[PDB]
Design a protein around this ligand. Structure first.
Ligand SMILES: Nc1ncnc2c1ncn2[C@@H]1O[C@H](COP(=O)(O)OP(=O)(O)O)[C@@H](O)[C@H]1O
Lengths: 294, 365, 18, 374, 49, 280, 45, 49
């Protein structure tokens, strides 16, 4: 009531309000209880979580059209990774629009849309998925500050406690050739046995997590630390003008309804997004922000 | 889609234990949290700003963990002691972590005159704090901020040695502290003064970062010297915070802030000589032009003309409040036409009927 | 003031009519 | 069920219709007017009532002050509605209300106290066994044979557009607009005063309404039609008044309904009906847009102007996206359709659980209608 | 009245036939659209084949 | 309370003199204006996007002067000549100035294979235009842009000889031109390819500005070698349809025709007692 | 007489309208066949 | 009186609050009977400022 059909735009960045007005119309929880012979409760819940992650990634502007892909694992007994179909914009993504494919890219579920998936764009995620049985959510992101951080020689520097919380960062050099299986082998070598954040040089920033909240936490920390570094390394001009935090000393001194280590930000922004009107149907750890009045 | 919530919220609660100045202080801290979110400086859950209500009773107010700065209300905050134990459970039903309060508690143990402590983690402030050299007086806002102190922060203040090392480095009379690689902390006797210092330092840090990045080095900055710069009455930050509370109230937000100088809105009017002055300071009636007066018999009733020489009343009114009063309401239309036929056809049949006769003639018969 | 204000007002009925 | 049929009573803002459920035609349709005498009656034995209701009131238009109990879809005289319901039950149908169930229709968005007052009046005085309240715009789609589509309704009270999705009325996308037939009649007076014909009393409002009903049409293009009317006199037609005078309506025939499309003629700042329907579809989600553009039903008394269908189709095509399936489905009996839908809904065997018993009302007061009927 | 009754029945039958013919038109347009877009794609490819 | 304007005004106009494919190109360039307005690149009219209608008839479509890019529609566009004469004016009661078309006119005289020319004045692209060694391909997007040509700009090209130097510096096959101190120009056979290249070069410039700020020198960065870098979908065909579809979902009456349908539209549940639809 | 003549005229328009619409149908089918043949001759070369 | 404040971007609170206040409070309040009181030239400059 009394609300415009489209939200009036800011002087800069009309994409935020425009995707807000689009999400006012299109619900991300497209499922309402129709027939689903292959869906599971966990599969449907992860579909809703992935659609909400796509919309949240679009909302912060952490998106470069459709050239980035985010994949998750159904955690079935064989393969079955969920990916956005190739072509739809991120504000257009719903739960039923997501496409389940195999590890090598074979479409096992064509979904609710006629658009096929990009076969070339899944091999980068397939290398990580074949590398680790522990990983379940892979996010590939492209922000200008992160690209500027990836383009420099030194890379990430321990100048903030958030970069210290990131931990060891795997670096993948820009081959630019896409040599398939040996490219997968080189990804497996550079990523290593255990790593949280990967930086694919001059192209993008990759976060891997056992859950959606973990990947969101890691990529948020990485992006914020990158844009911390951008200003101060510019103003410094050398090591003689920059203080570097010691990693080991800082990490040694610094350290159910109960939250995980990355569920707090996800649940707070889910509360925000449901107050917007996206009606995601996400299961909150606590159903109300405050106690009911007596 | 109406994301706004009333900041005051004291109306809905009807519970707990509050001091006389608790209402104003809670409204001030929640309005500060809303303003920090609404400038876009901070957006996620942390413990940024802390307040002291009573100078001789501690009982500091902090934000619960897990609440965004847009969702902060007055009743949802948590009152604790100097050590950090929850002496008063907040209205929000969220798990309580009081870890980040410890640094604020150390600063509270240092200065007695501080009441408002604000911590910032904005990218420009953190970029300034990560920089090796101190903040340069290259802007008017930085000149208006004043003196400052620099302290290396290891990220934890649980140890007693760190707390006792902060106290001398902070100084006896200092308003601005910089935690290296962590941001800035502003200390204020009042909330408005701390907010003013936070805003000025915030503007000055993007000024310094932009000028330092574009110029290259320090030589091109031609920085100034701070030493060469050197109702009742306003106290530093009264006017700006009052204006912000006024405009926020005009958004429809309920703020408990009372105004030292209230606002008067009058359209007024210009007198024009061409304009002329304002110069101000069912029933039907039947009239009878005469009035009749009852006069005793000279028994039989008699009525009297009462002409105008005897100062009689002029106009007698008769009021009719409804139509068709002359006709009875309940009547069959066929009866009149039936009786008309009955009367008329006796002419047709030509009766021998005579009129009624009086009974005085009947008696003699 | 009033005279030239009606001057202007009649100007905009000319502007507005055609 | 078999022994007694539920009474289907449609209470429109201008007309009132009544009949038995399971029947094709309503038994009695009459104007919803109540008149009081305005002159002194001097004939003793001819018989004059205190007030006249319905068709008897409209027969003697010259000696009455006609009053409408329903104003802009909102009841403003409840005892007057008691009179109109008494006239409906006892005179038009000659059936007792205590032996049959009744069915009532209502506007999609009405105050809660209005529903409570209707329930209290229908149970307390008439002592009906069972009653139910239905949305007026929903029953038209049931009469259409459809369960998904957008329903545009326009009566003498108010004009509203709703979307219906497998029998669900979306509360957010229901849109209201104050362009009714009464306002068109008033504008017909306002434009008739140009030619030299003056109507001012409530008796002549029925004459102006009959002129509007008999001699009006909707222009496909307004700008071409004004030039056509200025060029030649072939558009002029003559109407014959009850006192024998003859008037020539001429140009105004396509100027009376044009206030529906451009409300700026009446001084209202609101948008047209086509923009109202377009915005009503715009407020719903993307998934049901295709079957709302491909399925539109017109209903109401105002929507029987000749040429409204093609004009509506063109104006909604001008706002729709490209290569979009657009079709308007207007039944010929589009302003008897609410009663047809009510009788259809009352005819079903699974509808009998909707009835509110007298014991339920006696236990839960007049507020039970909102809990029982969502 | 009888003439009006004929005209009503004729209206109903004829307008149903109008709907059938219009559906056939819609099918023919989408056949055009597919053939025309794929011919334009062949022109864009510029392949000798 | 809304900026939303129907981008298709061809039906309400029902006038003017049009070519056989002109009315689709008008809607396409109006949509290009809407996208460049929405991203915040431009707000004030400076004759950004120019399109050639036909190879033989010329009659290039430009935006009128004075109308901001938010307010441009299909019927508001103006068809001008190569020199600046008015071929046809749409429903836009504004004074006609074709001064900004002179920048595109000699490019029309130089390369015919281009139809769409997009000129930018964004701060990042203008900073790169002032960046003396030009665009350094230290990012993937700058590698995706391709080759560039650099031309000195004195701000005027009415002169007869300046055109020769411009078409000399543009080259036979180069679709990105960088005028010094005057932003960038992108060159495309279709509006889709040109828009794709505009977006990618804008992203590359935004990356490069932050990189040159943060590094402080070329040696602190890494540059992959241009020699090492070295059905069918056209270069901008796939993305532009998604953008048009999303604007259609919001409500702009975009006249762009979609090559393939979006949804399957499973057949709904039909009853025989339907009144037959349509008004015929 | 009023709606008898009204239904007369309505029948007249809708009759001649369906005639024109069927003619449009078979013409657009012919155009589709011609474009299909031209598509084949382009695909051959 | 439910002013219906517009939603804001994560970095765009100023713009949203400014347009909400523009919707609520008009900048030209002199229209009506008060327009006579001020001069014709002065009122236009006040509106522009
Ligand atoms: N045959 C007709 N031609 C033109 N207008 C009509 C016709 N019949 C009714 N109307 C208009 O419809 C109005 C009656 O609407 P109605 O259907 O009674 O509204 P409701 O939906 O409230 O019952 C009248 O004011 C009249 O002007």
């Amino acid at each position: 009531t009394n609300v415009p059909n489209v939200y009036p735009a800011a002087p800069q960045g009309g994409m935020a309000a425009l995707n807000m007005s689009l999400g006012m119309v299109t619900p991300v929880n497209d499922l309402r209880g129709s027939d689903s012979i292959a869906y599971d409760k966990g599969e449907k819940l992860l579909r809703c979580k992935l659609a909400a992650l796509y919309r949240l990634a679009d909302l912060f502007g952490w998106s470069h059209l459709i050239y980035n892909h985010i994949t998750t694992r159904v955690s079935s007994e064989q393969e079955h990774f969920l990916i956005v179909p190739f072509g739809l914009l991120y504000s257009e993504v719903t739960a039923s629009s997501l496409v389940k494919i195999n590890l090598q890219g074979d479409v096992v579920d064509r979904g609710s849309t006629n658009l096929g998936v990009n076969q070339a764009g899944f091999t980068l995620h397939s290398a990580v998925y074949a590398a680790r049985p522990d990983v379940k959510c892979v996010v590939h992101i492209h922000t200008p500050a992160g690209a500027a951080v990836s383009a420099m020689k030194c890379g990430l520097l321990p100048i903030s406690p958030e970069a210290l919380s990131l931990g060891e960062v795997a670096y993948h050099d820009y081959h630019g050739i896409l040599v398939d299986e040996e490219e997968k082998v080189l990804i497996q070598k550079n990523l290593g046995p255990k790593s949280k954040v990967l930086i694919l040089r001059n192209h993008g920033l990759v976060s891997v997590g056992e859950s959606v909240e973990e990947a969101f936490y890691y990529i948020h920390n990485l992006v914020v630390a990158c844009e911390i570094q951008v200003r101060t390394l510019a103003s410094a001009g050398g090591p003689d003008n920059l203080v570097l935090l010691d990693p080991g000393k800082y990490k040694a001194k610094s350290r159910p309804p109960a939250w995980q280590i990355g569920e707090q930000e996800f649940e707070a922004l889910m509360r925000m997004l449901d107050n917007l009107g996206y009606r995601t149907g996400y299961p909150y750890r606590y159903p109300a922000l405050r106690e009911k009045s007596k | 889609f109406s994301m706004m919530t009333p900041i005051n919220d004291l109306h809905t609660a009807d519970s707990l234990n509050l001091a006389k100045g608790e209402r104003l202080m809670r409204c001030k801290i929640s309005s500060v949290y809303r303003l920090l979110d609404l400038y876009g400086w901070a957006q996620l859950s942390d413990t940024y700003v802390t307040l002291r209500v009573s100078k001789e009773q501690d009982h500091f107010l902090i934000s619960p963990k897990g609440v965004s700065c847009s969702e902060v209300t007055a009743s949802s905050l948590i009152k604790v002691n100097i050590l950090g134990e929850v002496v008063e459970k907040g209205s929000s039903c969220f798990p309580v972590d009081t870890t980040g309060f410890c640094l604020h508690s150390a600063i509270y143990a240092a200065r007695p005159d501080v009441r408002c402590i604000i911590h910032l983690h904005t990218p420009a402030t953190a970029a300034v704090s990560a920089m090796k050299w101190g903040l340069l007086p290259v802007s008017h806002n930085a000149l208006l901020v004043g003196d400052m102190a620099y302290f290396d922060f290891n990220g934890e203040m649980e140890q007693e040695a760190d707390r006792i090392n902060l106290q001398k480095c902070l100084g006896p009379t200092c308003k601005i502290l910089v935690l290296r690689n962590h941001g800035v902390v502003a200390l204020g006797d009042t909330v408005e003064e701390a907010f003013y210092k936070v805003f000025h330092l915030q503007a000055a840090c993007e000024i310094q970062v932009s000028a330092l990045s574009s110029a290259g080095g320090v030589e091109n900055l031609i920085l100034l010297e701070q030493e060469k710069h050197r109702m009742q009455k306003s106290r530093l930050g009264e006017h700006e915070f009052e204006a912000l509370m006024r405009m926020l109230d005009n958004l429809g937000y309920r703020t408990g802030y009372p105004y030292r100088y209230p606002l008067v809105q009058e359209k007024t009017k210009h007198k024009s000589e061409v304009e002329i002055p304002a110069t101000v300071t069912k029933t039907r009636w039947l009239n009878t032009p005469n009035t009749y007066l009852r006069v005793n018999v000279a028994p039989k009733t008699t009525w009297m003309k009462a002409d105008e020489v005897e100062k009689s009343s002029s106009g007698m009114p008769i009021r009719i409040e409804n139509p068709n009063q002359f006709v009875p309401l309940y009547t069959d239309p066929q009866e009149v036409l039936d009786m008309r036929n009955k009367i008329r056809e006796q002419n047709r049949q030509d009766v021998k009927s005579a009129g009624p006769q009086s009974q005085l003639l009947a008696s003699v018969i | 003031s009033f005279r030239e204000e009606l001057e202007g007002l009649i100007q905009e009925q000319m502007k507005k009519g055609n | 069920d078999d022994d007694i049929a539920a009474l289907v009573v449609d209470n429109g803002s201008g007309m009132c219709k009544a009949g038995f459920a399971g029947d094709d035609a309503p038994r009695a349709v009459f104007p919803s007017i109540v008149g009081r005498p305005r002159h002194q009656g001097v004939m003793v034995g001819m018989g004059q009532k205190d007030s006249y209701v319905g068709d008897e009131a409209q027969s003697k238009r010259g000696i009455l002050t006609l009053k409408y109990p329903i104003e802009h879809g909102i009841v403003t005289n409840w005892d007057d509605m008691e009179k109109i319901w008494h006239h409906t039950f006892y005179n038009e149908l000659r059936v007792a209300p205590e032996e049959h169930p009744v069915l009532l229709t209502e506007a999609p968005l009405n105050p809660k106290a209005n529903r409570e007052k209707m329930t209290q009046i229908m149970f307390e005085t008439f002592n009906t066994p069972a009653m139910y309240v239905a949305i007026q715009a929903v029953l038209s789609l049931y009469a259409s044979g459809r369960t998904t589509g957008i329903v545009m309704d326009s009566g003498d009270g108010v004009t509203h557009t709703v979307p219906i999705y497998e029998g669900y009325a979306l509360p957010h996308a229901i849109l209201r607009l104050d362009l009714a037939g009464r306002d068109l009649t008033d504008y017909l007076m306002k434009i008739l005063t140009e030619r030299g014909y003056s109507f001012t009393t409530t008796a002549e409002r029925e004459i102006v309404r009959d002129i509007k009903e008999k001699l009006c049409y909707v222009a496909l293009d307004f700008e071409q039609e004004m030039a056509t009317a200025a060029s030649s006199s072939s558009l002029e037609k003559s109407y014959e008044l009850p006192d024998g005078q003859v008037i020539t309506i001429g140009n105004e025939r396509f100027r009376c309904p044009e206030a529906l499309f451009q409300p700026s003629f009446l001084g209202m700042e609101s948008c047209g009906i086509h923009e109202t329907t377009f915005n009503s579809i715009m407020k719903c989600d993307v998934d049901i847009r295709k079957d709302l553009y491909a399925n539109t039903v017109l209903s109401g008394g105002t929507t029987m102007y000749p040429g409204i269908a093609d004009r509506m189709q063109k104006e909604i095509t001008a706002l729709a996206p490209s290569t979009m399936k657009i079709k308007i489905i207007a039944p010929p009996e589009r302003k008897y359709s609410v009663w047809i839908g009510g009788s259809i809904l009352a005819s079903l065997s699974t509808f009998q659980q909707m009835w509110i018993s007298k014991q339920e009302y006696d236990e839960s007061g007049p507020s039970i209608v909102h809990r029982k009927c969502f | 009245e009888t003439r009006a009754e004929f005209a009503e029945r004729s209206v109903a039958k004829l307008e149903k036939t109008i709907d059938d013919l219009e559906d056939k038109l819609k099918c023919t347009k989408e056949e055009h659209l597919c053939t025309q877009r794929m011919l334009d794609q062949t022109l864009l490819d510029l392949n000798e084949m």
